[PDB]
From a paper:
Diels-Alderases (DAs), functionally unique enzymes catalysing [4 + 2] cycloaddition reactions, have received considerable research interest. Our previous studies revealed that two berberine bridge enzyme (BBE)-like enzymes function sequentially in the biosynthetic pathway of D–A type natural product chalcomoracin. Unlike most BBE-like enzymes, which typically catalyze various oxidation reactions using FAD as a cofacor, such as oxidative cyclization by EcBBE20, tetrahydrocannabinolic acid synthase (THCAS), and cannabidiol acid synthase (CBDAS), and oxidative dehydrogenation by MaMO and AtBBE-like 1323, MaDA stands out because it catalyzes a non-redox intermolecular Diels–Alder reaction. Our findings suggest that these DAs have evolved from an ancestor functioning as a flavin adenine dinucleotide (FAD)-dependent oxidocyclase (OC), which catalyses the oxidative cyclisation reactions of isoprenoid-substituted phenolic compounds.
To gain insight into the structure-function relationships between OCs and DAs, we determined the crystal structure of a multifunctional Diels-Alderase MaDA1. Notably, two DAs (MaDA1 and MaDA4) and two DSs (MaDS1 and MaDS6) exhibit functional promiscuity, also functioning like OCs to produce moracin D (2). Comparative analysis of the protein structures of MaDA1, ancDA, and ancDADS revealed a similar overall fold to BBE-like enzymes, as previously reported. Specifically, they possess six β-sheets (β12-14 and β16-18), one α-helix (α11), one loop (loop in MaDA1), and a cofactor FAD, and share a similar substrate-binding pocket among these enzymes. Notably, the structural analysis also suggested the volumes of the substrate-binding pockets in ancDADS, ancDA, MaDA, and MaDA1 are similar, indicating that no significant substrate-binding pocket expansion occurred during the evolution of the standalone DAs. Enzymatic assays showed that ancDA is functionally similar to MaDA1 and MaDA4. In contrast, the transition state maintains an interaction with the active site of ancDADS-mut4 as well as ancDA and MaDA1 over the course of our simulation. Similar results were observed in the computational studies of MaDA1. Through crystal structure determination, computational calculations, and site-directed mutagenesis experiments, we identified several critical substitutions, including S348L, A357L, D389E and H418R that alter the substrate-binding mode and enable the OCs to gain intermolecular DA activity during evolution. Four substitutions, specifically S348L, A357L, D389E, and H418R, altered the binding mode of diene 3 and morachalcone A from the competitive accommodation to a simultaneous one in the enzyme, and provided the catalytic residues essential for the DA activity, resulting in the functional transition from OCs into DAs in Moraceae plants.
Author numbering: 30 to 287, 298 to 539
Write the structure that this text describes.
Amino acid sequence: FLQCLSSRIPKSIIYASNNPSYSNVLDSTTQNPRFLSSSTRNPSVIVTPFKISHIQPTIYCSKKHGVQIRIRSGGHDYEGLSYQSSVPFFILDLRNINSIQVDVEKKSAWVEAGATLGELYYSIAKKSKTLGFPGGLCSTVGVGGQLGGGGYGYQSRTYGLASDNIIDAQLIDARGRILNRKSMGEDLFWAIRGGGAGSFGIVIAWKVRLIDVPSTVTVFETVRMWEDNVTKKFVHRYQRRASNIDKDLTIFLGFRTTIQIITIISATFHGSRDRLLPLMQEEFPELGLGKEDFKEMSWVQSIVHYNNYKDDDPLEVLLNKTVNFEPNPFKLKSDYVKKPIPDDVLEKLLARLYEEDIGYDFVEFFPYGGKLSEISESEIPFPHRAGNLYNLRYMASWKQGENTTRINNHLSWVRSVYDSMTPYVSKNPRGAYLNFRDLDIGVNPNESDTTSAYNYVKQASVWGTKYFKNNFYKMVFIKTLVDPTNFFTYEQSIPPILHH
Ligand SMILES: *Cc1cc2c(nc3c(=O)[nH]c(=O)nc-3n2C[C@H](O)[C@H](O)[C@H](O)COP(=O)(O)OP(=O)(O)OC[C@H]2O[C@@H](n3cnc4c(N)ncnc43)[C@H](O)[C@@H]2O)c(*)c1C
Ligand SMILES: *[C@@H]1O[C@H](CO)[C@@H](O)[C@H](O)[C@H]1NC(C)=O
């Protein structure tokens, strides 16, 4: 494999195990610290192209020598699939493929896969205070992965997901052909906008629609005690109102221990605080929030704020490539909720936070509705639309270095929490969020360990219909057309219809 690469691409973009910088390049975007001790995080080579023509030979060498491709842009995949495999593999790391072209007059931008959300937001904000992009929250996330999987954040109720706002793309397929929207066709251009683009090809660049944002947005955040009847009433009404209120207001909810359970309420309102005050006093008067609890800022300042930087920090903090906190290993799972959880079941859920160490486990609510209930189930592969109140996320975290038995304890905790919620969350299929990737919901069999093509597809649909509902089956046909030999494979790759 390595011989084939070195006779075809410059040595300067090739990092093998023997290279002293291999470990830095590997670790630099291993973004879930849980996998820093994974035995499957051992690519034989990391390739870091700096121009497009570097990529086609890596496809050729990968096919000819049986070395599986793992595509990494931001490396934020929550299961670390961009840098692990149980078969011999290499990482095509697109960090240097990162140019951004912003057209303020046409309200559009071309963004290469290795650019981060922070770099995109930075480039927009340097040119206009009133344009934005609803890309998601984390400034270090790569657009290469994010825009292929949905991409949710404080703007999604107002403007849609990141994948709801894509108008062209450049993609390299398994034959090494570099295609745009016109030459890839509408089916494949549909599939990559939220279907997990790495099942179909290597996205080189996305063309996005820029959104009009108000020159003033308003944020607020407060921490309350859960053992407080006003907090409980607010949360009771939150379940019923968060997805139905004014689409300009998005409110997140989080719970952790600190010994009591605290409730974190955080929000962004796409408007001034004079507009926000009557809305909050009509929807949640029990919060008692005054004029001075709302802080006005620009759209990009609100992104800086919610990435744990100072409100008045220079925009350059958006260009940093690692999070502004030291991260703990973690395992998250998520569910979709269509009916309010009963009061006493919510109490039983939150009490499970007492079972592990203080402040290390979390339950979080991300509301749907708004624009997300206006878009059909099949507009793009992302299917989680009207009828969903919120996505409910469960997470356990621990410190780097805990022994195996304690990690298993943490994994078992969050899995049992998930199992306990089966009666109260979506079913048939039990929905799951691709960008909250969870291997526990099902993985592919080894294609050689199936008994038929139908068998391969049906097994894969276990996880497939959870992420995509029946968009999964349209994606199976598209996969069959554009990658019939299954060059792009991994634990949750869309399967082709195998010929024999
Ligand atoms: C670490 C982190 C992740 C976050 C954060 N906040 C999020 C939020 O507010 N909303 C979300 O919806 N997701 C959030 N995430 C998760 C990540 O945004 C998603 O998990 C993305 O999928 C990660 O994208 P990226 O940064 O590129 O990480 P990768 O591992 O490189 O990509 C994930 C996935 O996509 C494939 N892939 C990447 N690049 C390509 C290209 N060019 N072509 C095809 N396929 C590609 C990878 O193989 C992998 O499977 C907040 C934080 C702190
Ligand atoms: C982010 O960029 C700013 C500007 O240089 C810098 O002050 C800050 O330390 C950076 N954040 C990091 C290194 O996490």
